[PDB]
Amino acid sequence: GSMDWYCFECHLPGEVLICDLCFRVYHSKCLSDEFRLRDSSSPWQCPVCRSIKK
Give the residue with the Cβ less far from Zn ion, 12 or 41: 12
Residue 12 near residue 41, CB atoms below 8 Å: no
DSSP 30: G
Is residue 53 close enough to count as binding Zn ion by CB under 5 A?
A: no
Residue 17, SS3? Answer: strand
By CB under 5 A, name the one of 4, 13, 15, 22 that touches Zn ion.
22
Is residue 31 close enough to count as binding Zn ion by CB under 5 A?
A: no
Q: Measured over all CA atoms, what is the biggest interatomic distance in the chain, rounded to whole angstroms?
A: 44
Residues that bind Zn ion (CB under 5 A): 7, 9-10, 19, 21-22, 46, 49
